[PDB]
Amino acid sequence: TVSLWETVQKWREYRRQCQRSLTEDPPPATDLFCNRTFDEYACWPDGEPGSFVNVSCPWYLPWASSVPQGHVYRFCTAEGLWLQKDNSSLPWRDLSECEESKRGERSSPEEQLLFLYIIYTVGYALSFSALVIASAILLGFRHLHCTRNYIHLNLFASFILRALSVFIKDAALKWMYSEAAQAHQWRGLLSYQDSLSCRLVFLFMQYCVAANYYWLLVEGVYLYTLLAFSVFSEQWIFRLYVSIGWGVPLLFVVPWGIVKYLYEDEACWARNSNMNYWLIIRLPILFAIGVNFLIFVRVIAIVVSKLKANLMCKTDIKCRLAKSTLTLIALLATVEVIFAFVMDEHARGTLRFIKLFTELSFTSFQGLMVAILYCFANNEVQLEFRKSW
Amino acid sequence: XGTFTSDX
Ligand SMILES: *[C@@H]1O[C@H](CO)[C@@H](O[C@@H]2O[C@H](CO)[C@@H](O)[C@H](O)[C@H]2NC(C)=O)[C@H](O)[C@H]1NC(C)=O
Ligand SMILES: CCCCCCCCS[C@@H]1O[C@@H](CO)[C@@H](O)[C@@H](O)[C@H]1O
Ligand SMILES: CCCCCCCCS[C@@H]1O[C@H](CO)[C@@H](O)[C@H](O)[C@H]1O
Ligand SMILES: CCCCCCCCS[C@@H]1O[C@H](CO)[C@@H](O)[C@H](O)[C@H]1O
Ligand SMILES: *[C@@H]1O[C@H](CO)[C@@H](O)[C@@H](O)[C@H]1NC(C)=O
Numbered sequence: 401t402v403s404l405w406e407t408v409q410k411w412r413e414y415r416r417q418c419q420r421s422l423t424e425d426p427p428p429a430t431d432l433f434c435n436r437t438f439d440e441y442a443c444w445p446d447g448e449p450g451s452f453v454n455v456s457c458p459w460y461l462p463w464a465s466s467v468p469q470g471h472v473y474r475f476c477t478a479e480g481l482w483l484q485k486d487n488s489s490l491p492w493r494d495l496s497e498c499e500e501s502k503r504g505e506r507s508s509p510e511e512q513l514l515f516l517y518i519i520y521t522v523g524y525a526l527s528f529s530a531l532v533i534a535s536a537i538l539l540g541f542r543h544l545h546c547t548r549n550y551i552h553l554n555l556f557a558s559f560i561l562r563a564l565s566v567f568i569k570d571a572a573l574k575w576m577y578s579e580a581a582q583a584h585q586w587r588g589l590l591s592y593q594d595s596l597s598c599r600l601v602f603l604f605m606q607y608c609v610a611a612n613y614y615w616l617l618v619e620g621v622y623l624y625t626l627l628a629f630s631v632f633s634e635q636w637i638f639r640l641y642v643s644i645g646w647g648v649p650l651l652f653v654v655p656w657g658i659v660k661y662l663y664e665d666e667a668c669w670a671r672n673s674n675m676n677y678w679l680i681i682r683l684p685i686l687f688a689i690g691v692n693f694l695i696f697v698r699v700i701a702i703v704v705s706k707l708k709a710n711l712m713c714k715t716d717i718k719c720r721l722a723k724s725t726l727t728l729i730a731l732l733a734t735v736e737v738i739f740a741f742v743m744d745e746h747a748r749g750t751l752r753f754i755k756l757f758t759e760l761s762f763t764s765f766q767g768l769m770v771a772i773l774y775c776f777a778n779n780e781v782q783l784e785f786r787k788s789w
Numbered sequence: 790x791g792t793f794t795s796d797x
Contacts, residue, residue: 403796509797516793566790573797602794609790671795681791744792756793 401508402462404576405671410460418443434476439491441585447476457498463506470497495585502584508577512753516760521570523764524563530768531556534775544784547638551622552774554645558615559767565608568601598668603657606681610649613688618645620692627702652684675745686741693734700726733762
């Protein structure tokens, strides 16, 4: 399956070689001739007056190989002008042997990414719903208005905004492969590429993602403050957390958009080359991931030190649940993320597929895991729910 | 999301 971006790359190479032919082919035998031209769909050579000119359908089409016997043609008119209709104001061409271009299926993404799409979409759907319910529950009860509950409420808003931004991304990319945007000799998709809407949605996604990871970092730092300090921490730290979880991701996400116009503005900030520019966003995100993991492990050390004597059946339950969250996030997530600094520069393949599988399924279902963990499974929320019911 | 979009 030939992807859009790969089609653009091949087309650009077609244009390079094509312009080179335009420059190097010798001029025609006589000045009675219409001029060779590249019309962005084919390189037309000079034409004898009153004759047909043929070129193969341009090979950058994803399906050019299915109609190799087809050709596209122009007519060089007898007045030495290219034939054009008084109407279309643009020169006539016949693309019919290559018209399956409008309705063919060859320009599709790799099916494996479509396999991951249903998974992470379902995970952000259930996470979005349960986070909406749980956020309504913690927000709704005046007796539950804890400071830590407001922190978890901010984490819920971060996961929800993340699921929304990923939904708008899936709508945009789904439209990019739709038959309407993939018009015959598609141009409306290019007009969408020039739009601010093409890039602003993806930048908004980048902010929701970096804000989600930084909010997980605020969650880990808050747990370490409640446990290592054992203090009833105040509002100055809370004002700091509000500045951090929405502020820092803005702080390194804005430059990524500035560079995204200054270079790769033709990419609609979707596909990205120049790996350092992509490190501009992911590298701080890798920092938040690794630091949140290290605070996680340190909290595990604190619980290993402080509960050393007590063992009850509830400790057998919740302690095993801590083994579940460790084996899910500590044992696996940080391995793929810390190695990911090397895993996208190289080491692609089925290993890349397993990497996207574990990371996508993880962060997709982590919002549901946080909704059930910080709300529905909380004991005080259960007894308080049974107080009225 | 950001990485997956590329190959997509
Ligand atoms: C240019 O391409 C087309 C074939 O794709 C040729 O045009 C055909 O020529 C006949 C006359 O000999 C026309 O009546 C037909 O209408 C054309 N075919 C089609 C399908 O339109 C033409 O011969 C080619 N020119 C050269 C120099 O090879
Ligand atoms: C018919 C009788 C039914 C009675 C139900 C009582 C609930 C058991 S509390 C159990 O342990 C807690 C430890 O924190 C929490 O984890 C809870 O979510 C739950 O798992
Ligand atoms: C009735 C005939 C049905 C044929 C189905 C074809 C399945 C394609 S497999 C898939 O193709 C991709 C190519 O882009 C590769 O990248 C992947 O590694 C590979 O898993
Ligand atoms: C291990 C299975 C080998 C037989 C075929 C099925 C697996 C396909 S690998 C797949 O190929 C793509 C490019 O070709 C890459 O973009 C992906 O990252 C990678 O996951
Ligand atoms: C088109 O014709 C003009 C004659 O007016 C000639 O000067 C060239 O510009 C020619 N096009 C190219 C690419 O040489």
